[PDB]
Structures are given as structure tokens and as C-alpha cells.
Amino acid sequence: HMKRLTYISKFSRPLSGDEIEAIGRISSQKNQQANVTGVLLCLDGIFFQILEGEAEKIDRIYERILADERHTDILCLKSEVEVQERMFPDWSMQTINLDENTDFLIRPIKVLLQTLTESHRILEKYTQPSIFKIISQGTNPLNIRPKAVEKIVFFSDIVSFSTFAEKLPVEEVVSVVNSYFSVCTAIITRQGGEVTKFIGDCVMAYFDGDCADQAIQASLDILMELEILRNSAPEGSPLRVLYSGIGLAKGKVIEGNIGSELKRDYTILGDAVNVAARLEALTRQLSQALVFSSEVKNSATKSWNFIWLTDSELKGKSESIDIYSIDNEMTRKSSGGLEIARNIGHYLERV
Amino acid sequence: HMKRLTYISKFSRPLSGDEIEAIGRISSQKNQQANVTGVLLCLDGIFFQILEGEAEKIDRIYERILADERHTDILCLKSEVEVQERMFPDWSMQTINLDENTDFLIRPIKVLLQTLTESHRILEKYTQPSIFKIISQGTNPLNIRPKAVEKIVFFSDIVSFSTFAEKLPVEEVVSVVNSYFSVCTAIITRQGGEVTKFIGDCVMAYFDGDCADQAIQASLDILMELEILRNSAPEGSPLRVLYSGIGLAKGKVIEGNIGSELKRDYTILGDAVNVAARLEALTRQLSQALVFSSEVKNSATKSWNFIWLTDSELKGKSESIDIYSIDNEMTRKSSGGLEIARNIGHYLERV
Ligand SMILES: Cc1cc2nc3c(=O)[nH]c(=O)nc-3n(C[C@H](O)[C@H](O)[C@H](O)COP(=O)(O)O)c2cc1C
Ligand SMILES: Cc1cc2nc3c(=O)[nH]c(=O)nc-3n(C[C@H](O)[C@H](O)[C@H](O)COP(=O)(O)O)c2cc1C
């Protein structure tokens, strides 16, 4: 099996001739001890690199490049798993600095490579990094046929969020939404989870089938990070009255490409999604900042201090579902805030 | 003012060197009469084109280029708002056929330009067409500061989707959703709307502030299209029992780059978003496919047969708002389907 890695990279520090040449030197040298090949390119503070060789050798090389101080946003563009005949056998790493040389046919292609990457950097921010990992794994996400997979759906939102949008100016509101979103996304990803949607102030994420505990943990930390943010903010910041509401549900969902021909997403779709959505909806009524289904509770390895709440039902297998929260110091501090939903408005009046 | 335009197009039908010569010949001569300049390129069924000249003139040229049969997936990667000096003044439309020329420098450049567009085509699918429209105007989306807009928020979902998921296979479930999403996206964009989000089987979209009347019309047109779909689908097709509920709301919104730093989107936020989303849910209870807020009714020009429905609220500001619908041949046909939605599972079992 022969691999083919292609990627883009940004210059973290403005590199000069001596530094650029040094990168080109080591590359051709080390590749000879591993038989591996490829081509290096350069333009307006951007790197372009193709690589060919053995899967175990090639994967070790890419890992090393990710540690360099002058490298930021190392995005793999294509990864061919099985290759019969290498497209670059006569070379090792023939560096091509287009920043220096200017010809006739190259001049238009130069502008092209600048605008193409520029645009590719703009899309990168608006695309779900879940698809980028798929490309890097060596698969076209559009080619993925939908599958039946059991998962834990996470659904959260900002408590009495409408009062922020009603009182505060448009700029102040979005910074608070984004703040919350960037917090919620961070904790979930690091816990091996995936944020897949947003709607107003809603966040919708998912974790593995067995990842019940990792999900419970993620919700507790979201509350935790918000507790610090409620106090540690200065007197005259809306971030003081920021509270979350979280819902979790386990079940079999359909994950794949779901949307119009124009725009789609590699997300989940199932009954569990709505089960979570509706459970979270109940956090303001149950006065518990965290709410989850009995299936989540049973799927847990750890023996958490679970609270049982007045069971309610909707769709599914027609049968009723049991609602559970967790009795913790963090939950107690956050579950009381749902009855402070009228004391938050008093604060937002002054600002 | 002067304008520069860079875009990526796809080869519709297989074209040979002789047909590519014509594209170059006709363009360059028209360019000299226009005064405008540029470069055209060829690759693995991909076009690349820079175009520089007077604003109106360039637009009138791009307009014809947007109507040529040889094209597909035409996305202008960049649009330079006000240009001071052009970058190809000595050559008007100098074509470059990379399929015919094989050189030392250009061979690895070709593979790179190909993979950059290949990966760019995939990112294009997972992105809001709004950001692509934003780019074409000139400005960058990631640099748009949030603003106070007044807009009609549309919200819709598949009626008794819960039953479709359980009975039909994964491949089949997914298609029904997408099929529904295309129907909504088509008719929404046509009437001036912008589908901003998907969430499981929900569609969030928005029409402009004064375009309330058109926003109502699209909702009617969506039901109308689904009627046709149901009436004409063969035996065994789930499209026979495919119903939709629609919730509209008018009022101020906060448009902007909402999300994390790992993933963001240019969408809506505010009061209206939630109102609209709540009214769509109420359609299942109030058994009326089309449902809208009090503000939508007051902003309507044409005299529709407005049916008043049971006034209520959830969260909001504890205040109840007048909830309406329409008494039309289509509304009355689709509204009933919500009451008989309780026994649509029988047909879905039959497959
Ligand atoms: C753009 C770029 C390309 C590189 N290409 C290669 C390469 O082809 N082979 C290689 O072994 N290292 C390559 N490197 C990584 C260098 O070897 C690395 O900077 C460093 O010298 C590794 O430290 P070491 O000698 O302690 O392992 C590249 C680095 C950069 C910035
Ligand atoms: C890839 C491509 C690029 C084109 N570029 C130009 C151009 O720069 N200028 C132009 O006038 N026509 C260009 N055309 C041709 C137009 O699509 C169209 O045929 C022309 O504007 C109308 O020509 P006519 O009035 O002689 O029929 C291009 C076509 C293709 C397929």
C-alpha cells in the first residue's frame, strides 16, 4: 500500500531567504533514508506539498511537520490510500519558490493559487471540521452512504436569552452568543464529541453510543466554565447573567449527508434528536439546568448522584420515559438560576 | 469604478482543443471592443477565469458567461470592488490549455490546481449559498460586523417524520428529507428567501421585512408542491404520505457570523426566530398546516381569508399573540392531514 498526502500551510512568522532555503534542505535529505517522495511549493506566505511513499513512513513525517513553529492551519486536501504508480519518482522534494520567479504562463496561475487558497481559507471557517477530518482520513464525505448508528444527542441553550436581544445592542448580543458557543464547542470536542448544529442560541451536539459518561461530564463542565464566567466578569458585562440548560438522550440515529442539493451537512437525524431537544425544553419547568433520559443514566459506567424527576412522554415506542438530573454543587448553583430568570432582566436594564 | 472577477466553472459536455480555441477566439475579440482584459484556463474539465474592466461592462460580460451551456458550478472566488491598476493590460483573454502542455515546472502545479478545486468543490456543498453570494458582491463574510435587520422568519418540518424514520430503511429516510428540503429551498429562493438552517428535519429560512406577502405565498406554494408530490407518487413511495407544517413570524432580528471559532455561520438570531419555530410546533396541536404570527397578518397587502386560532405563548414575555392561518383550497386540503397523521404509519408499514 502506497499513500499520497497533499496539504496547505500558513507562515506563522515572516520567513526570509535563509530560513526558506533551510526548510528545503532538510526535506530532500531525510526522505532518502525512507525512500519517500513528493514536491514542495511557495507563494505569498503559503506552503503547498505533495508526498508519496509507504503508509507507516508517510504518516510519521506528517506528524513531525505539525510541530513546527512557522506552521499554522496544516489542512490536508487529499489522501490517496492505494496507489500503484507514483506520479513523482525522479524527485525527493523539488522546492519551487514562486514568490521569487516570475515567467509568462506562471504569472496568471500565480494569482489563481493566491485567490483559490484565500477563498479556501474563508470556507474553512464556515465548514464543520468533522468533514476536514473525513478528507484527511482519505474519503470523500459526499460519497458517504447514510448509516444507522446509536449515539448520545446533546442539546443546550442560553436561559432567558430573549432579554439579551431585547435590551443590549446588536454587537453586545452576538459576542455573548459566540462566547457561549465557543465554550460549549471546546468542552465537547476535547471529550471526543462533535458539535453539528446551531439555531439562534441553541447548540446541538453528539457523542458515541458508549460515550454516555463523557457526555455527562461535558455538560457539567459547560455549567462549570459558565459559573466562573458569571463571577469573573466585571460589573457592567452581560456575561454575568449567562446560564445554560442542557438535555441528553441515547438512541439509534441516522448520520449522513442531510440537506438540499445546494447545501447539506454530515449530521445526525433521528427520534433521539427530538427526545434531547424536548428534554432540554423542560429544564426551565423542572428548574434543573441539566436534564437527561433514563437510557443515558443506565448506559453510564460511573455511579453519579442521579436525581429522578416527574416522568413525561412524547412519540417513540408510545411508552413513557424517565427524566434524570444530577445532584452536584455545580448543578445546584446552575439549577437555581432558572428561577433567577427575572433577576437577570434587572441587571440588563443598567447596561 | 473598475472590477476584477475570478471564478471556477465546470465542463458541461466533453470539449476538445478545437472547441476550446473558439471560446478563446470569440472572447478576446469581444474583450477588445469592451476594453476589458483577462485570462482563461483549462484543466481536468475545470475552467478558471480572471476578468478586469469597467463595472457595468464586466457585469454585462459575466451575465452572458452565466448563460453559456459549456458551464456548471460557476462560483466567483473573488470580486475586487475598486481596482486601481489591471494585471494583464498587454493581453486581452489569453487562453492557456494545461491539457496540451506538459512541462517540468507546470506538471506538479496542475495536480495542485486540480486538488485545490476538487477539495474546494466539496466545501462548496457544505456551505451556506449566502456566503458565496456575499463573496460575489465584493466584501468578505468573515469581516461583516453584526447588524439590526427587520425580517420575516419561516420555519417548517415534516409532519409525523417520527413514523418515517422507524419504518423506512436508512437510505430511504434520508432521501425523503432531502426531497423535502429541495422543495422548500427551490420555492424559498424563488420567492426571495434564504434557507439558513437545517436541524434534523426542520427548515429555517428568512424573507425580507416588507416581503411578508411573498413569504406567505412561498409557504402556500410549498404545500401546493407537496400536494402534487403526494397525488402523483406511485404505490410504495413514502412521498404519498409526505406532509409539512409551516410556521411564519415577522419582527426585528440580528444577522451575523454566529458560531464558534472552529465553525461559524452567517445567519439570524432574535425574538422572531423562536416565535416562528414555536408556531410550527403548534400546527400539530391546532391542526392547521400553515400558521403565522400577528405581525405577518398586519404586514400582508392582498386580502387573504385569515382564520383566527387559539392565542397562547411559550417562554416569550408571558403575553399571548394573535395566531392566524388562511382559508384557501390548499390550506384546507393540507390542514386535515395533521389529524389523519395519527394513522399514516399503516401505509409506511405496507412497504
Ligand atoms: C514545509 C515543510 C516541509 C517539510 N518537508 C519535510 C520532508 O519532506 N521530510 C522531512 O523529513 N521533514 C520535512 N520537514 C520537517 C523538518 O525536518 C523539521 O522542520 C525538523 O527539522 C525536524 O526535526 P528533527 O530533525 O529533530 O526530527 C518539513 C518542514 C516544513 C516546514
Ligand atoms: C469559459 C468561458 C469563458 C468565457 N469568457 C468570455 C469573455 O471573457 N468574454 C466574452 O465576451 N465571452 C466569453 N465567453 C463566451 C460567452 O459565454 C458568450 O458566448 C458570449 O459572451 C456571447 O457571444 P456572442 O454575442 O458572439 O454570441 C466565455 C465562455 C466560456 C465557456
Residue ranges per structural domain of chain B? 1-144, 145-351
- Contact between chains at B131 and A127 (C-beta distance less than 8 A): no
Q: What is the dihedral of CA B309, B314, B319, B324, to 10 degrees?
A: -20
Ligand 1 pocket, residue A68 CB under 6 Å: yes
Ligand 2 pocket, residue B37 CB under 6 Å: no
Residue A332 carries which side chain, given as an amino acid letter? R
Q: Which residue of A has its CA nearest to B120?
A: A120
- The grid cell for A140 is 470523500
On the 0-12 / 13-18 / 19+ scale of CB atoms within 10 A, A339 is: exposed
Angle between helices B212-232 and B170-190 (to 10 degrees): 140
Q: Which of B288, B185, B176 is nearest to B241 (CA)?
A: B176
Breaks (C-N over 2.5 A) in chain A follow: none
Spatial separation of the C-alpha atoms in residues A81 and A241, rounded to whole Å: 51
Q: Closest to B162 (Cβ–Cβ): which among A39, A254, A315?
A: A315
- The grid cell for A178 is 459566540
Q: Distance from the CA of B1 to the center of ligand 2, in angstroms?
A: 22
Ligand 2 pocket, residue B64 CB under 6 Å: yes
Contact between A8 and A69 under an 8 Å Cβ cutoff? The reply is no
> Which residues on chain B are in Cβ contact (under 8 Å) with A118?
77-78
How crowded is residue A327: how many other Cβ atoms within 10 Å of its Cβ? 12
> Which residues on chain B are in Cβ contact (under 8 Å) with A87?
111
Spatial separation of the C-alpha atoms in residues A151 and A158, rounded to whole Å: 24
Q: Distance from the CA of A17 to the center of ligand 1, in angstroms?
A: 17
Contact between B126 and A265 under an 8 Å Cβ cutoff? The reply is yes
Q: Closest to B123 (Cβ–Cβ): which among A108, A127, A269?
A: A127
Longest dimension (CA), chain B: 75
- Contact between chains at B123 and A118 (C-beta distance less than 8 A): no
Binding site members of B for FMN: 30-31, 49, 64, 68, 70
- Contact between chains at A111 and B87 (C-beta distance less than 8 A): yes
Spatial separation of the C-alpha atoms in residues B48 and B63, rounded to whole Å: 16
Ligand 2 pocket, residue B68 CB under 6 Å: yes
Q: Which of A86, A90, A91 is nearest to A54 (CA)?
A: A86
Spatial separation of the C-alpha atoms in residues B343 and B341, rounded to whole Å: 5
> Which residues on chain B are in Cβ contact (under 8 Å) with A108?
39, 41, 50, 88, 94, 96
For residue B126, what are the contacts with CB-CB under 8 A and spacing of at least 6?
A127, A128, A131, A141, A263, A264, A265, A266
